[PDB]
Design a protein around this ligand. Structure first.
Ligand code: HEM
Ligand code: HEM
Ligand SMILES: C[C@H](O)[C@H](O)[C@H]1CNc2nc(N)[nH]c(=O)c2N1
Ligand SMILES: C[C@H](O)[C@H](O)[C@H]1CNc2nc(N)[nH]c(=O)c2N1
Ligand SMILES: CC(=N)NCc1cccc(CN)c1
Ligand SMILES: CC(=N)NCc1cccc(CN)c1
Ligand SMILES: [Zn+2]
Lengths: 419, 419
């Protein structure tokens, strides 16, 4: 039966029944709890060597088709049963099946809808889908991605979108983007042991250099796209600079902020996740939404392991940078968050502060419970990296479970790749 | 075997083997994750009607005795085996057993050490234990508690301490403190629907009033102690005002802060938890440590469901209180945190900011892994209510499991009490 869930802020109670559809086992054991693990196996969908067994696929495929046709207001039994039949025949005769464009569209929005770590799921229905299932080469990939970047960026007025490339067949011809994000900065380890740029991309930057890319050695050097089509080796493509919109950071009071020389790309596009639907797997389906301040202000700029700009901004504010209990870190990070939001608005690039994001997610969560009695939600990821208890999601209890469709992680392609 | 755990901040890896000793099942299922549940059953140890079965007790008792004697540098096999024998005989002849003072001391520090939601466990070894196992009446309880409060408060220089009252026998004569905390403010619902004081204590305040306590109707009215000795009904005792040390809040710049009329008790003492050790249960064992800024500054003052002073301090700062994206909440809460720390230091009352607390916990966690290969830790509770990613614990992966000794929650005494 349902699991009782409470919001200590409003005292409200919800009954989650949706979790009953969860699939395999999650992270945390039966007696241990592995909830703060970023990459648990229950969240990763690795490579394959052979096709998915008919016995497994068919059952899932039927399930999905039933889910799709079930989503309609006033059904279409005939079309429904018809579809189930066609899919069965297709698997018997081909060994797999093709989703109708409409079902793919439905599949991508549902998987988004079922992303427990996404705070912007209130937009799950507003998503542009580019069907690249016909793609054959890396060159065509690069072309599609470019269309995507251009469509999504929309001159600052960001639009959510996803590009679906060929589904995995035998797992021996997988289409993959070796990049973590469509657009990202490179990390160079200078001779003197000093890291320059985005430390998070040190290994990947090396990979690109290894694949022949010319390293410019700058704090903000956009990395090349490394595409892998039909199981083939990867090819490196520079991304047209005109296509990459960036926001230069500047604070509305501390005019010395510009003197830090900060900027960040406007498009947050995930490139390496796998889309699973009806037994089908899409190892290459780059998607994007718009930024939430804290991602850049808090994590990207202040993470000790990223650009780590917190002490500098601290000193530039003349704070007791050496008296930890002075709470200078609290003062600094907040101003850096104001610079990010302010600088994005100034330049007309869509962005949303964390307080507002949190509010909408609660609204969404309520709709999800009224709509289907549940909302897979990972509290650890949904609560903003700053102002935790000051946002309402912090006070909301939640259940995290893997449904289907879903967006899984994958093993880094350079590890599992036969050159 | 061990579970690999990583700290994304340092990239460091740890191997947790300690979880192997975990007992029953935790919160999160096999496929679902109930990690953000405050009161899961796996964390509560309710009432009993009969004694604990010999078959269960003996096994646990032996386990504990083995753990105790095992903790020594260069053992005492003779004393050890001797002790195991005496305890066995004692259970056979009495139906339970008594812990030596030393074992109780060891038991209380271990249970603290095994508290997954405690960020100050680096102090687990520094804890004063007051043995009240001989207590017979409520009056004697009240006396002990008073000694505790006086000892712990130590004129501002707070000292960690715990008072252990009689262990549960048949569960029909349980010693219980009906209070959530030794010292806490009352919550009154004014006629016009307006809450006054601490909203979190509305129900309990009513209970005290029902039991005859005279309601003064103020924002900061210290609640009476409601003691229950040997299964008897509860009796209400006013706490000697001289014994309750309080800090009046004031900001080191915004002199208008004093005009808010804020203060808070200096002693954070948990009163309603149950201590479990060697099959034994102690339903009444009030303990205390010292405050961590955010508890008061962030949660108590800013929780919408507590004193909710965030918009007031916002306006008093002349912030865009109506433009959520202005991040005024971020500015306000921080100043309220500075007032708390500043006001505590000013008056010489021990307190620790969250950044410093977080740092020490990491140090402790490292010691715990080197010492015993593990540290039961609940990430959701250990990460401060503000400046999440700015503190190192946010970036540390951790496993949460219930070991023994342990401090369990209990069912509210007024629900399970035969008057
Ligand atoms: C339109 C507004 C959107 C906003 C503001 C938003 C915001 C967020 C944030 C803050 C995160 C956390 C990222 C991190 O901390 O590294 C996240 C994660 C995620 N979002 Fe969204 N999102 C949006 C759109 C999308 C879209 C369109 C999709 C997919 C179709 C999506 C799928 C996900 C997934 C799967 C994650 C998990 C990423 C991971 O596990 O690494 N999001 N989102
Ligand atoms: C000496 C310094 C100490 C500090 C700074 C400290 C700090 C904390 C904090 C911040 C919490 C979270 C409370 C909340 O958010 O409601 C907590 C919880 C807890 N602490 Fe500590 N603590 C200390 C000492 C103690 C002592 C001495 C014990 C026991 C002997 C203890 C046992 C626990 C337990 C069991 C919890 C869980 C409370 C619950 O689940 O409601 N702590 N502590
Ligand atoms: C160890 C811990 O799981 C890890 O640091 C998590 C915490 N919460 C997070 N939340 C979001 N949105 N993004 C992250 O990368 C993380 N990191
Ligand atoms: C719903 C959620 O579990 C709840 O709000 C938790 C989150 N983390 C917490 N952390 C601490 N220290 N104290 C709390 O009361 C909470 N509340
Ligand atoms: C769409 C959005 N706002 N953010 C999702 C996201 C962007 C960049 C990196 C990561 C890390 N997985 C997630
Ligand atoms: C000892 C310490 N610093 N804090 C523990 C604590 C104090 C008051 C209330 C609660 C809520 N369970 C916990
Ligand atoms: Zn869990």
């Amino acid at each position: 039966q349902y699991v009782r869930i409470k919001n200590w802020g409003s005292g409200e109670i919800l009954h989650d029944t949706l979790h009953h559809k969860a699939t395999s086992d999650f992270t945390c054991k039966s007696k241990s709890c592995l909830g703060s693990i970023m990459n648990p196996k229950s969240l990763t969908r690795g490579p394959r060597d052979k096709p998915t067994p008919l016995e497994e696929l068919l059952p899932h495929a039927i399930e999905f088709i039933n889910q799709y046709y079930g989503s309609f207001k006033e059904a279409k039994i005939e079309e429904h049963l018809a579809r189930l039949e066609a899919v069965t025949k297709e698997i018997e005769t081909t060994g797999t099946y093709q989703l109708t464009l409409d079902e793919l569209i439905f599949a991508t929005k549902m998987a988004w809808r079922n992303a427990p770590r996404c705070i912007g799921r209130i937009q799950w229905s507003n998503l542009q889908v580019f069907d690249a299932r016909n793609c054959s080469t890396a060159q065509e990939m690069f072309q599609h991605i470019c269309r995507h970047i251009l469509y999504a960026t929309n001159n600052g007025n960001i639009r959510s979108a996803i590009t679906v490339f060929p589904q995995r067949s035998d797992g021996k011809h997988d289409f993959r983007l070796w990049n973590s994000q469509l657009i990202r900065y490179a990390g160079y380890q200078m001779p003197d042991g000093t890291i320059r740029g985005d430390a998070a991309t040190l290994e990947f930057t090396q990979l690109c250099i290894d694949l022949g890319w010319k390293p410019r050695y700058g704090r903000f050097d956009v990395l090349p796209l490394v595409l892998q089509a039909d199981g083939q080796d990867p090819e490196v493509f520079e991304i047209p600079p005109d296509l990459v919109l960036e926001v230069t950071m500047e604070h509305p009071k501390y005019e010395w902020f510009q003197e830090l020389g900060l900027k960040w790309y406007a498009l947050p596009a995930v490139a390496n996740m796998l889309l699973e639907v009806g037994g089908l797997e899409f190892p290459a389906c780059p998607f994007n939404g718009w930024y939430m301040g804290t991602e850049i202000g808090v994590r990207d700029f202040c993470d000790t392991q990223r650009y780590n700009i917190l002490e500098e901004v601290g000193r530039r504010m003349g704070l007791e940078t050496h008296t930890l209990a002075s709470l200078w870190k609290d003062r600094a990070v907040t101003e850096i968050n104001v610079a990010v939001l302010h600088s994005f608005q100034k330049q007309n690039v869509t962005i949303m502060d964390h307080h507002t994001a949190s509010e909408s997610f609660m609204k969404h969560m309520q709709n999800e419970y009224r709509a289907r009695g549940g909302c897979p939600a990972d509290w650890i990821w949904l609560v903003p990296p700053v102002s935790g208890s000051i946002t309402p999601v912090f006070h909301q209890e939640m259940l995290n479970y893997v449904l289907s469709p879903f967006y899984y992680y994958q093993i880094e392609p350079w590890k599992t790749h036969i050159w």
